[PDB]
Amino acid sequence: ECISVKGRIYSILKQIGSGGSSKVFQVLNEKKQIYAIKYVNLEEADNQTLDSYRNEIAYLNKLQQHSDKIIRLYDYEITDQYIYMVMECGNIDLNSWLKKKKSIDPWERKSYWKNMLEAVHTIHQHGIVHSDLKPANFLIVDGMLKLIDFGIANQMQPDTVNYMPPEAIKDMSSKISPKSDVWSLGCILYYMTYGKTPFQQIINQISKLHAIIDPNHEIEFPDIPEKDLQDVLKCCLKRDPKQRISIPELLAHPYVQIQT
Ligand SMILES: Cc1cc(-c2cnn3c(NCCN4CCOCC4)cc(Oc4ccccc4)nc23)ccc1C(=O)NC1CC1
């Protein structure tokens, strides 16, 4: 099949992702340059969904300039029937790359952590809190991690509640701040370090949600060479968000600033 966007015509290689009424395709332009196109079918979309898609496109647009750790938006086309967004294609999403690697170079993990903090910090500066970060939200391209979305519109999945923060659960029934994203980033780094998510081994959602909120449930951190890392994990995974480390701090931390 093919897709046209503002004139230009693109050929579908395959479908790399899917969600409610939308699909992401890997595609090629005329000069055989590769891109990711998101297609949103708006035909039965409520005004809230409509507005959330409008808000994503606008934020994606504005944030272009502020970091190259945010996915590139080259062009889009929006009508009443559909959206098409032409964006950069990556090598692999971080959630897939994590299941395949299964022992991560410490240098690559540290570099990737910086990439994530910078992307997320960037959206925090424009008043966004993602609130649902997980490794699927990040994408490897060149040698760096880019943020794919902002938690604004429907989440897509590649063709998952380990990462939820305590404030969000105790929220019911706002306590959501930028710290909420630190928690989820905490969990992602934990996974890249210990090879699992802090509350992964717990068995059935409903119990795990109590654990996540329960102070007495001591979260455990095996000792490891890198103590900068160990400290980062501890600081991100504090349950009281007022005492949780912030992203500006994280960026000032030896784990990020100091190599070897
Ligand atoms: C959802 C989305 C996805 C990409 C994208 C761009 N490349 N890419 C890739 N890379 C290629 C992976 N593969 C395929 C087979 O092997 C060879 C290479 C995977 C992927 O997997 C996914 C798929 C879904 C969810 C997460 C991750 N999503 C994307 C860019 C933007 C958006 C998006 O709508 N953002 C919102 C507007 C703000």
Regarding whether 202 and 148 lie in a shared domain, the answer is yes
Resolution in A: 2.3
Regarding whether 156 and 252 lie in a shared domain, the answer is yes
User: Considering 69, 91, 113, which residue would you say is the last residue of a domain?
Assistant: 91
Regarding whether 50 and 157 lie in a shared domain, the answer is no
User: Considering 91, 106, 136, which residue would you say is the last residue of a domain?
Assistant: 91
Regarding whether 98 and 69 lie in a shared domain, the answer is no
Regarding whether 64 and 13 lie in a shared domain, the answer is yes
**132 in catalytic set:** yes
CA distance 177 to 181: 8
Write the DSSP symbol of residue 73: E
User: Considering 64, 91, 118, which residue would you say is the last residue of a domain?
Assistant: 91
Using DSSP's 3-state secondary structure scheme, residue 188 falls into helix
Residue 232 belongs to domain spanning: 92-260
CA of 85 to the centre of ligand 1 (A): 12
Regarding whether 124 and 64 lie in a shared domain, the answer is no
Three-state SS annotation for 79-116: CCCEEEEEECCCCEEHHHHHHHHCCCCHHHHHHHHHHH
CATH number reported for the structural domain that contains residue 19 in this entry: 3.30.200.20
How was this structure determined? It was done by X-ray
Q: Is the CB of 36 under 6 A from ligand 1?
A: yes
- Phi–psi pair at 148, nearest 5 degrees: -90, -40
Mutate to test the pocket of ligand 1, among 16, 28, 33, 52 (most ligand atoms within 8 A of CB): 16
- What beta strand segments (E) does the chain contain? 2-5, 8-19, 22-28, 34-41, 73-78, 82-87, 92-93, 138-141, 144-147, 157-158
Q: What would the two tokens of residue 126 be?
A: 């424009």
Regarding whether 36 and 160 lie in a shared domain, the answer is no
Number of domains in the chain: 2
CB 35 within 8 A of CB 74: yes
Q: Is the CB of 123 under 6 A from ligand 1?
A: no
CA of 252 to the centre of ligand 1 (A): 30
What letters, b where the CB count within 10 A reaches 16 and e where it falls short, cover 195-227? eebbbeebeeeeebbeebeeeeeeeebeeeeee
Q: What would the two tokens of residue 35 be?
A: 């891109």
Regarding whether 142 and 31 lie in a shared domain, the answer is no
Using DSSP's 3-state secondary structure scheme, residue 128 falls into coil
Q: Residues with Cβ < 8 Å from 196, sequence gap 6 or more?
A: 190
CA of 145 to the centre of ligand 1 (A): 12
